[PDB]
A paper describes a structure:
Mutagenesis of Cys425 to Ser broke the disulfide bond, but two mutant monomers interact with each other via their cross-linked C-termini to form a strikingly different “close” conformation compared to the “open” conformation of the wild-type dimer, in which the C-termini of the wild-type monomers are oppositely oriented. Thus, the mutant [name] monomer structure contains four α-helices (α1–α4) and four β-strands (β1–β4). The conformation of the four α-helices and β-strands β1–β2 are identical to WT, while a short β-strand (β3, S449–M452) between α3 and α4 and a long β-strand β4 (β4, T487-S493) at the C-terminal are formed for stability of the dimer during the crystal packing. Two monomers of the mutant [name] also form a dimer in the asymmetric unit, with their N-termini in parallel and in the same orientation. The C-terminal β4 strands of the two monomers are cross-linked and form anti-parallel β-sheets together with β3 at the bottom of the dimer. Ser425 from each monomer in the mutant dimer is oriented on the outside of the dimer, far away from intersecting C-termini of the dimer. Thus, mutating Cys425 to Ser does not directly influence the interaction between the C-termini of these two monomers. In the case of the [name] mutant, the disulfide bond is dissociated and the dimer adopts a more stable conformation by crystal packing: the flexible C-termini of two monomers are stabilized by hydrogen bond interactions between the amino acids in the Ala488-Thr492 (β4) and Ser450-Met452 (β3) loops, which form stable anti-parallel β-sheets at the bottom of the dimer, resulting in clear electron density from residues Ser489-Leu495. The intersecting C-termini of the monomers result in a “closed” conformation of the mutant dimer. Thus the conformation of mutant [name] dimer is not likely to be physiological but instead an artifact of crystallization.
Here, we report the crystal structure of the C-terminal hydrophilic domain of nsp4 (nsp4C) from MHV strain [name], together with the structure of a [name] site-directed mutant. The structure covers an 89 amino acid region from T408 to Q496 and is shown to possess a new fold. In particular, the C-terminal hydrophilic region from T408 to Q496 is highly conserved among all the coronaviruses, indicating that nsp4C may play a similar and conserved role in coronavirus replication.
Residue numbers in the entry:
A (entry chain B), B (entry chain A): 0 to 88
Write the structure that this text describes.
């Protein structure tokens, strides 16, 4: 989907950007994402690739409410840091 | 792009998914990947997100060649098992 897809890319949250994003997600999900963010906010270490994706959406949510209560500033959105460890594929 | 998007998912390679995938990628690209299989098959450790993506592609290119060379018997493609250590912003 566009939202989760976007939460996995670096970009600027702007007027256009944010508008695009509010309209690609349901507020029930958006507010759900905004809640979990607290779950991860201060967590560092390994997690399954599926948990990373859910986590990134959370950060996108937070990054969005920040821009919205900025008065249309512009905020940089970078996916949460990822050091992936694979072994001989 | 189709090739990479799928290198990120688990699916059964069939005559139909081989082909869709092959048509999408140039021989140069496919072979490069196939060739990078020889790098990642032995990689064991931390890599960033783009590297993991190229890693998953080399793994799919390889699975396709395994498909092609076993007379088209189904071969399950599966992205390289991974754990991402994270921190947010």
């Amino acid at each position: 989907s566009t939202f989760e897809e976007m939460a996995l890319t670096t970009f600027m949250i702007t007027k256009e950007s944010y508008s695009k994003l509010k309209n690609s997600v349901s507020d029930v999900a958006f507010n759900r994402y905004l809640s979990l963010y607290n779950k991860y906010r201060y967590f560092s270490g390994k997690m399954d690739t599926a948990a990373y994706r859910e986590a990134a959406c959370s950060q996108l949510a937070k990054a969005m409410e920040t821009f919205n209560h900025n008065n249309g500033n512009d905020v940089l959105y970078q996916p949460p840091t990822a050091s992936v460890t694979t072994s001989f594929l």
